[model samples]
Each structure stands twice: as C-alpha cells, then as structure tokens.
Target: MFEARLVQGSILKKVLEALKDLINEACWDISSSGVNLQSMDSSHVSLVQLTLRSEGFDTYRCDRNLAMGVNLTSMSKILKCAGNEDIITLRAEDNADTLALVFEAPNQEKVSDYEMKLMDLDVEQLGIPEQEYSCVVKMPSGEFARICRDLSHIGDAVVISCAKDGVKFSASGELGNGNIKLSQTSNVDKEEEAVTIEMNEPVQLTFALRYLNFFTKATPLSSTVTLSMSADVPLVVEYKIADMGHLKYYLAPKIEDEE
Candidate 1:
C-alpha cells in the first residue's frame, strides 16, 4: 500500500491546476521518496517536471515504487471538492487501478471521500541535464505573470534580454509593442519581493508568450519565480513549492522571426 497526507489541500489543488493545462494524462511515479511527474505537452514544445518530496508531506509511506497514470482533469475535479484547510490524504493499494483521496476537516468537523480511475499511459521520460545558464533572473511571480499577460496582447512571442544592468521583456505586433524591464534591487528591505539577476554574459532569446502564460499558473506556488536562459537553449522557469520541492517548466525558444 502507498499513502501520503498533506495538511494543506490548496497546495495539491494548485499543483493540479498548474499541470492540467499543459498535460492531459500523466504518469506519476510514487515511491518512498515522494510523487514525481515529468510530461511534455502534445505539441512537444514545452516540458513540465513536478516533484513533491516525501519529506514535505505530513505523512508518507510506500512499500514499493508504483507508477500511477491519471487523467489530471478528473483528479482536479475531485480536488475541487476539498477545502483549502482540509487535510488531504492519497491512498492506493498495491497494483491498484484506482486512486483514493480523503479530505478531513480540522477537529474532525467534516470529511469527504473521492476516488478516480487510473489509466495506462505510455509516456516516455526525457533526460534533462543540468546546464550552465548564461542568465538567471529571480523576480516576483506576480510581476512575471503580469508582464506575460500584457505582452501577449501585443504579440505571439516575447523577447527576453538579459544584461548586467537588468532584464527586459519585449513584444511587438500589429497592435504595436510593449516592453517591461526589471532592474536588480539592491539593499532592499524585503528580499522576497526584490528582483535579482545573475549573468555570466549577456544573452537574448525569443519565446512563445503562450507557454510563458501557461507557466504563470504556478504563481500560487511561490512569491518568487526564476528564469534560467542560455543562447539557443530552452528557457527554464521554476517556482519553488515552499519547504517542498519545485515545479520546473522548460520551453523551447522561438527561432528566427524576431525584431
């Protein structure tokens, strides 16, 4: 049997919300370590990697490693029944074809039970190696979301330019153009809200705004979002899951057709 419990239901809810948009069906590798999912969109233009460590859960157990394939939309619908304060527990028997979820209210005031039928998804895991990114920018998640939302209205792609001074996001279209620049904030009182950039060298790349916008669904996971970029390499956007692990997105950069 395998079981895991989390004190905050909203965390799981948000996690599913962020994933369901990009991946319809996913295979979760469950083990004593935790649950992990790595999937690529149907178009194969973007990849998402999610890690929920066993240590992050209130309770966790696994007799052996199990791969559970699930339709995320169905799982998400069940999670919607959970209250933010509910204690969420996931359970499955050895080689079970269904996953069970239990939501318990604090002080034993309320409870909800749900079960979702599992699937057999033939998914391939990609080997993503660590790279030395030319530019890594850490900034407010909300700011990044807003920039993507605003720039998407002006164009289909956004050019990200990083320099020693700061980072700039720009887009152009028939409607005109929009640009937002964020400078590294030094000597800031609120470190969490500060924008910081580390660069080995200046690099600029164009990426689809649609994919960036999809990644912003993870804004609820953390206040700060990180963007790691290198020339001609995929852009990595990461949101740390506070005390847990992190959810990472890799989007292939747009080649050619840039201003």
Candidate 2:
C-alpha cells in the first residue's frame, strides 16, 4: 500500500504542468521519502528530473517501494479538476493496475476522485555523473523565461556566455540577432531580485532555445532559477520547490556546424 497527501494542490498541479511537456509517460518511483521521476525526451536532447519529498506533503506512507507508470498527459488533465487550494491525495495498492487521486475542498463541501490506468514501461534510468561546472548563474525565473521567449523569436539556438562581469544570452538567425546581458547586482536590500554568478573560468555554449523555453514552465515553482554550465557539457536548469526538493532539466548543448 502507498499513499501521500498534499495540503496544497497547486504543488502537484505545477509539477505536472512542468513535466508533461518533456515526457509523455514515465514511471514514478514512490517511496517513504517521496516520489521521483527521471526521464529523457524522445529525441534524447533533454532529461528532466523531478522530486517531491514526503516532508512537503501533509502525510506520506509507503509500505514498499513501488514504480507506478503513468501517462503524464492524462494525469495532468485529471489534476485540472482540482483547485489550487484543494487537498490532494494519491493512493495505490500493491497489486493494483490503476492509480487513485482524491481532491477535497477546504470546507469539505466538494470532493473529486479520479482513477487512471497504469502501464508497464520499458524504461531505463541512466546514471548521470556529476561534474564541477565552470559557470553557475543565479537569476530570476521570470527573467530567464523572458529572455528565452524573446530570443526564440530570432533563432533556434541560443548562445550562453558567462564571465565575471555577468552572463550573456544571445541568439542569431535569418530573422535577426538579439542579445541580453545580466549583471550581478550589489543590492543588499533585495537579494532575491539580485542576479549572481559564480565561475571558475569563463564558458560559452550553445543550446536550443526551444528546450529552454519548455524549461521555463517551472518558473511558477520558484522565484529564482539556476543555470549550471561547463564547456561542451549539458546545461542544467534548476528550480527549487521551497521546502520540498527541486525540479531540474538537463539539455545537451547544440554542436556548432564546422566548415
């Protein structure tokens, strides 16, 4: 038996919204610790890692480890019925073929229940080795989203160049070229609004703006966004889940065409 209850339905709602774009179906590893899902996109260009910790939920129980394969689109559709303030509960049995979801209003005046058929996916979780990144940029999530959206209009690829001064996001295409530079702020009053950069050496890499735009879907989950990059290494975009763990997206850098 396994069950988890979240007092804030919006948490799961935002999580599903962010995940459904990259992965169609995936197996969620459910345990007493929390629910974890790691999946690579069909094109193998990006990977998404999601973690919802038990501490974030009102109640969490897991008799045994369970891998629940679910259709992300269907699950996201079901969550649309729940209000942001509703209480959401997830339940599944040991030998069950379906997953159960319950949503209750604050006053208990209304409740919604949904059951989704589960599938057995032939998926492999690959091991991702850790590396010391050359550049780590911390900025506002909304700022990152806006930069991606704006640059995407001009090109398919975005070049991210980081230095001690700040980080520059630029794109070039048939339409035109656009660039935006963000500098670390000295403001002590509002640290959240300040942009920060930590770098051992300067680094520049190119990536598809499309994937970066897709990653911006998690902007609602946190005010800050982190971008970790190294030469020729995949970019890691991460958003914190407050008291919970975090949602991370890794996109392989686009190789520049050689003459």
Candidate 3:
C-alpha cells in the first residue's frame, strides 16, 4: 500500500516539452520521488542520466516508484490548456496505473489525467564517471530553439562543439550550412545575444538536433538554461521550474562521421 503525491505545477509543462516530437513516453519513477530519466532514441544510441534530489521538491512523499509512460503531444495539449504560472499537483492512486495531474491558475482552474502502460525498461546504472568540465554556458532556451529550427532545416544530424572561446553549433547538408556560434567575450554585436559559457575545459560534442529540439522547448518557460558536456559523455541540459521542480535532460554524444 505505497502512495505518494508531489505538488508541482511545472511537471506537466516540463514533461510535455520533454516529449514533443518523441514517441516514447517520459517514463519516471514517481515512487520515492527522488529523480531519474535516461533512454536512447528508439535505437538506444542516445542516453541520459537525470538526477533530482529531495531538495528539488516542495512536498515529496512516497514509498514506491510508479512506472509511468505519457504521450508527449497529448500531455502538451493538456498542459497548454493551463496557464504558464499555474500551480500543479501530481498524484497517483495507490496501486494504480494512472496519474492525476491537478492544476490551479489565477483566473481559472484546470485538471488533466493521463494513463500509461508501464514498460519493462532496463534501468542500468551508468558507470560513466562524472568528469570535471570547464566549459559551461547559460544560454537562453529560445536561442537553442532557434538553433534547432535552423539546423533542422538543413538535415538530421547536428555537430555541437565548445571550446575556451565560445561554442559552435552547426548542421549542414547538400544545400548549405546552418551554423550558430556563441563567444565568451562581448566584442560581437549581439551583446545580449548568443549563448553563455565559461572559457576553461572546452566541452564539445555532437547530438541529434531533433532530440535537442525536444529539450529546447523548455526554454520559453525558464529564464536561465544550462548546457554542458564532454568529448564522449552525454550532454547535460537543465531547466528550472517556477512553482516546484526542474527538469534535466542528458543526451549521449554520437560518434563523429558515424552516420
């Protein structure tokens, strides 16, 4: 008889943004209400290691981990119906296979419920040691969104490279090149523009723009966004929520020239 309830207004929004174009449901363990999410893009090439501790929540209480699968589009439709600053609560019936998402807004009230068939996901403990990264950036989610739009216009794969100076994001095709560069200094005209980053370890990697686009949807909702990665390790992107919690997305870097 394990039961848990987390009061979060951003879960639906974050979850929906994280699910956009992807087909798989954003599976989460709502039992202990700690934090974890990582899966490849259908083929298992992409992977993520998401972590949320007890401090990330306002009210978190649970005894069992509830396996949940939610359609991204469907969830988005439901969340879009609510206000951006609405408060939400996620509750699961004891020993049930459904999740109840409650929302409260200033001028209106909205509630949504979603059902998902639990999947037999093989949760593996990734032994990838955390590396001390030097290059870090706080870019607007919208900037990344624009990059996704432009790169996606060219082709499928996107090359993401970061160094002590700034970062380089590009996706090319037979037509031309789609590129986005952000430097550490303000010599460029776009002062308030470009992505933000530190000049140190220089973290560079490649990722699927489609998946990165999905993660970028969270930009409009959050102000400060973080993008970090190493040579071969997964790229970690994080977005903070206003009401209760935040969402962390990790994307495993694809091998260079391995189309």
Candidate 4:
C-alpha cells in the first residue's frame, strides 16, 4: 500500500482547479522525487507540467515508484465544493487496484472515500528540453497575473521586453497602447515579493494573450512566479509550489506572419 498526506489541503484543491481549465484527466507519475504530472494541454499547442518533491509532503509512504491514473472531474469539482481546509490524503492498496482520497478534519474527523478508478495505460511523458534560458525573471505572481490580464484589454499579443534594468510588458492596439514596466527590487521584508532578472542577451518576444492569461489562473499556488524566455522557443511561465513542486505552462511565441 502507498499513502501520501499533506496538511495543506487547499494546495491540492487549487492545483486541480487550475488544471481543470486545460485537461480533464491525467496519469500522475509517482516516484522518489515525488508526484509528477505532465501533459499536453487539451489544445495540443501548449503544455501543462507539474512537479512535487517527496520532501514537500507532511507524510509520504511509498515503497517504490508507481503511477496513479485518475480523472480530474471529481477531484476538481467535488473537492472544490468541499472545505479544502480538510487535511488531504492519497492512498492506494496493492491487492485492491483502486485509489482513494481521505479528507480529515483539523480536529481529527476522518472521512475517507474513493471512486473505483483503475487504468494501466502508458503515461506519455514529453521530454521538455533542459537548456540555459536567456533571461529568467522572478517576480511576484500577483503582479504577473495582473499584467497578463490587463494587456488583454488592449490587444491579443503581448510583446515582452527584458533588460538588465527591469522587465516591460506591452500590448498595442488601434485605439490604445497598454504597457507596464517592472523594476528590480529586493524587499527586505518579503524576499518572495522581489523582482530579480538574470539576463544573458536581452530578448523581446510576442506571445498570445489567451493562453498566457489562462496560465495566470494558477497564481494561487505560489506567491512568486518565474518566467523563462529564449529566442525562437516557448516561454515557460512557472509558479513554485511551497518547495513541494511547481506548475509550468509553456506557450509558443507568435511569428511575424501575425504581424
């Protein structure tokens, strides 16, 4: 039997809520590193990637690596309606080829129920490249979400410019040109709120707003967000998951054909 529990139930709830926007189900690949979820978005153009380390959970019990294939409907909808404050636990037994969810109240009320979900299909793991990013900007997740949402009002494509000084997000339209600039600052009070940019060669690229805005919905997962950009490659928008994991969305850049 394998059992994994987390005190912060809201974390799992929000993760499912965010993922439901793109996919309905996925095969969670569980390993020593932790829980991993990677899938091509329903649109097939972008990718939704997730990573959680073993150390992030409050209690983890897995003798070896395994996989859990489940639909996201009940996990996202029903769980959303429930009080996410309930401590969340995931368990699976060896003899019983089924998975279950255990929700415990803070005061020790145990409510464990599960659906009969069993699938042994191959979980196709797309190998996202590992390369040096030209510019990696770490900024407040709240600010990034607002910027992406705000630019949608002006145009469909956002031209993101990065420099050693700061980062600029801009969108222009026939009637208006909307842009926001962010400067590098180290907050002594809240380091997670700081904006830090590491640049090799400055890059300005265009991305579609619809997909970028959709990814912003995950801002609830982490206070800090990191965006990685490189010329001619997809822009990776990632939010850290309490040192437990991270959720990353990759969007391809717009070509000059759209210009």
Candidate 1, residues 191-216: lDDT per residue as tens digits?
A: 68888889998999999999999999
Evaluate residue 237 in candidate 2 and report its C-alpha lDDT on the 0 to 100 scale.
Answer: 99
lDDT tens per residue, model 4, 110-198: 67555446666555677876898899999889999889888998898999999999999999999889889998885554556789899
How much lDDT does each candidate structure score? 0.92, 0.91, 0.64, 0.83
| Model 4: lDDT to the true structure | 0.83
Compared to the true structure, candidate 2 yields what TM-score?
0.97
What's the residue-level lDDT of 173 in candidate 2?
Answer: 90
Tens digit per residue, CA lDDT, model 2, 226-248: 99999898999999999888999
- Name model 2 segments beyond 4 Å from true: none
TM-score of each: 0.96, 0.97, 0.71, 0.90
Which candidate's lDDT is highest? Answer: 1
Better TM-score candidate (2, 4): 2
Question: What clash pairs does model 4 have?
Answer: none
- Ordered from best to worst TM-score, the candidate numbers read 2, 1, 4, 3
